[PDB]
Design an enzyme around this catalytic site. Structure first.
Site, mmCIF file in Angstrom:
data_model
loop_
_atom_site.group_PDB
_atom_site.id
_atom_site.type_symbol
_atom_site.label_atom_id
_atom_site.label_comp_id
_atom_site.label_asym_id
_atom_site.label_seq_id
_atom_site.Cartn_x
_atom_site.Cartn_y
_atom_site.Cartn_z
ATOM 1 N N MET B 103 0.854 -1.182 0.000
ATOM 2 C CA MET B 103 0.000 0.000 0.000
ATOM 3 C C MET B 103 0.896 1.241 0.000
ATOM 4 O O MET B 103 1.890 1.272 -0.718
ATOM 5 C CB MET B 103 -0.938 -0.023 1.215
ATOM 6 C CG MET B 103 -2.055 -1.075 1.111
ATOM 7 S SD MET B 103 -3.096 -0.841 -0.353
ATOM 8 C CE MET B 103 -4.472 -1.985 -0.015
ATOM 9 N N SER B 104 0.578 2.259 0.795
ATOM 10 C CA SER B 104 1.322 3.511 0.685
ATOM 11 C C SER B 104 2.731 3.524 1.275
ATOM 12 O O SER B 104 3.410 4.548 1.219
ATOM 13 C CB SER B 104 0.507 4.671 1.263
ATOM 14 O OG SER B 104 -0.566 4.989 0.393
#
Lengths: 381, 381
Positions: B103-104
């Site tokens: 993800m981020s």
């Protein structure tokens, strides 16, 4: 209306996750570890432009071999004599351990998984398809036996045009963009197929192989992806995993979607020439291998695209059998893929290519000329 | 109208191949060796159900650690102290060398690639985005500097609803099913973004990172996929390739789409704690690392979701900076991903998870409690 299929993960609802649900619980625990199954993805290389030619050993007998490989759009080429790699070629930009799409060489791998389950007594080729997949009742696969699917001796209305079955098959499986009204997945597509009911004559049809994979799933309870590993790939002592494209339900595209390295594909041929035994255990029976090498019914084989070159050729259990004086047998895929067996010299030839065209008489003449010349170069002299 | 982008392969036309053209020449030579970039695909394992807990070493100081990891939906957890792996945990069904979506945390990797190009003098953070991507003229990115993108100090109308920007971003990139009228690719989506023109206040926005990746492409001429390898991954001496999802043009989803093993992700943290140097060479400058560890402007940081826990926290160059007494800095992603740096003990903590929810105060309190407790357990006593 296609019945029970193997869950994408333990406890998963039918058809879950989709592209629109994989971030949601409980799907995300699986999806975060397998995102490539949901979304197209690229490798970010851990390693920081020229062709690699190591032709042996056979270069002396075939002086123009590299040029002939170039001319047939060869990406990877490998000759395994016994247990030894005796010749290799890889084009510029393709590494020895890069994976390559197998196209319908994938079919021969699927047939091998079926053979493993026959050896275990969990599939009886004499039984009708509907013994294992009742939901195929009412389709062209209602009536024929599993062996007739294996040998591709079922008459099917299957046009080889977006309306054609060949492209509709690809759209249903995710190889092409969906059109409105298209079947949702590969299983549904298979149930739409019809024929006049006749059997016994060879008709090459990719739908047959996906029916085999469906049978494998119903018999084992495993996703075809996992069955292909359990019954074949994990026993090969392969260098790398293979990959297989999957449709929106996670069903592996059994008839055409496998990719692997040339060296690892050769391990499948090695297993066939070792009577069905691989490093990790027996894969198929001695009898199964013998039946493959023996060939199918010659009278069933009316494909002049094959018999013009191989008059006594045939097809059985997802392998093409040349019936030539060498007893050559091969897995074959469009654009120039071969897993070619040369039992006389105990050798396997892998050729993975990208011809501009899926099939022409021109390409097949050239391709077969190379495989035969290389086979003969391996003979004792 | 988004200008020049790196070709998918040498000589490729813009935007080629697509899902509907990859079987055609000249695309197929590349596509047959990279099909996972076009069609969702599954691994067929070359290897033939229980959690693996090797907590050290720190289990004595944290007796309930495994239960706490279970409670926060931990998939992979690894502590690297200096060059030594001193604690590991993997849930049942997740192997030590399995890859996990970042993800981020992916953003911190993207910022690192930007930093590498700053070190080379090919990107000047003081310059406007439009110096490198003129086609972003007329958008919210017309005016702000590259550093303001790096520090996420641009006011953007970006709703976090299929009409919302967050989901539209995902649809444009292929993480979700396209809706009619949606932008064709990630570049086009970015050009649609608007804001009131104000800068200087932190606003976390995933679009910022993809603009950084676009700049990387315009400066280097490399696909972001390749730039991420060349400037970072290939210098780590990683065990496995990473992967990154790509949109229909082959553009890597820079802000959220990377997957890798926990051990390999730790190598990124090791590089940061080694002043920017990795086994394969320097990745970023000593100065860049120093600026990351120093933090961003505290006054810009008005996100109470962060400052309620870390009052003196801030954000710079795609890293969250806690400003706590330990100087902890972390890459962070939804559902419980952290690349957590503990310079005091020369340690890196990787935690990769799958919380049912992308974010709640509840999960972040628990997650940060674990990372802080583990960091403190590493202190000399």
């Amino acid at each position: 209306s296609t019945g029970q299929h193997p869950a994408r993960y333990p406890g998963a609802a039918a058809g879950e996750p989709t592209l629109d649900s994989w971030q949601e619980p409980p799907h995300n625990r699986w999806a975060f570890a397998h995102l490539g199954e949901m979304v197209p993805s690229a490798a970010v290389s851990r390693r920081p432009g020229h062709a690699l030619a190591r032709l042996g050993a056979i270069a002396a007998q075939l002086p123009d071999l590299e040029q002939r490989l170039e001319q047939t759009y060869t990406d990877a080429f490998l000759v395994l004599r016994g247990t030894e790699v005796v010749a290799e070629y890889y084009r510029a930009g393709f590494a020895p351990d890069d994976r390559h799409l197998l196209m319908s060489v994938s079919k021969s791998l699927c047939g091998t998984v079926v053979g493993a389950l026959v050896d275990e007594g969990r599939i009886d080729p004499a039984q009708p398809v509907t013994e294992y997949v009742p939901e195929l009742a009412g389709s062209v696969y209602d009536g024929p036996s599993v062996l007739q699917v294996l040998d591709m001796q079922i008459s099917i209305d299957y046009n080889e045009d977006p309306a054609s079955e060949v492209q509709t098959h690809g759209r249903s499986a995710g190889w092409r963009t969906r059109r409105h009204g298209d079947p949702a997945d590969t299983y549904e597509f298979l149930t739409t197929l019809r024929g006049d009911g006749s059997t016994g004559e060879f008709q090459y049809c990719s739908a047959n192989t996906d029916v085999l994979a469906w049978i494998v799933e119903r018999v084992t309870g495993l996703r075809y992806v996992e069955a292909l590993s359990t019954y074949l790939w994990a026993k090969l002592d392969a260098d790398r995993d293979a990959t297989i494209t999957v449709d929106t339900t996670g069903f592996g595209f059994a008839h055409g979607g496998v990719s692997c390295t040339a060296r690892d594909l050769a391990r499948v041929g090695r297993m066939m020439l070792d009577g069905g035994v691989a490093p990790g255990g027996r894969v198929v029976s001695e009898d199964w291998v013998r039946r493959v090498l023996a060939g199918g019914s010659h009278e069933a084989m009316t494909d002049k695209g094959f018999t013009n070159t191989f008059p006594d050729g045939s097809y059985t259990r997802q392998w093409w059998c040349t019936g030539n004086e060498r007893g050559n047998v091969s897995g074959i895929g469009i654009h120039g893929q071969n897993l070619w067996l040369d039992p006389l010299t105990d050798s396997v030839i892998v050729k993975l290519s990208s011809w501009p065209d899926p099939y022409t008489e021109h390409w097949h003449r050239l391709q077969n000329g190379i495989l035969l010349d290389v086979s003969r170069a391996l003979d004792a002299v």
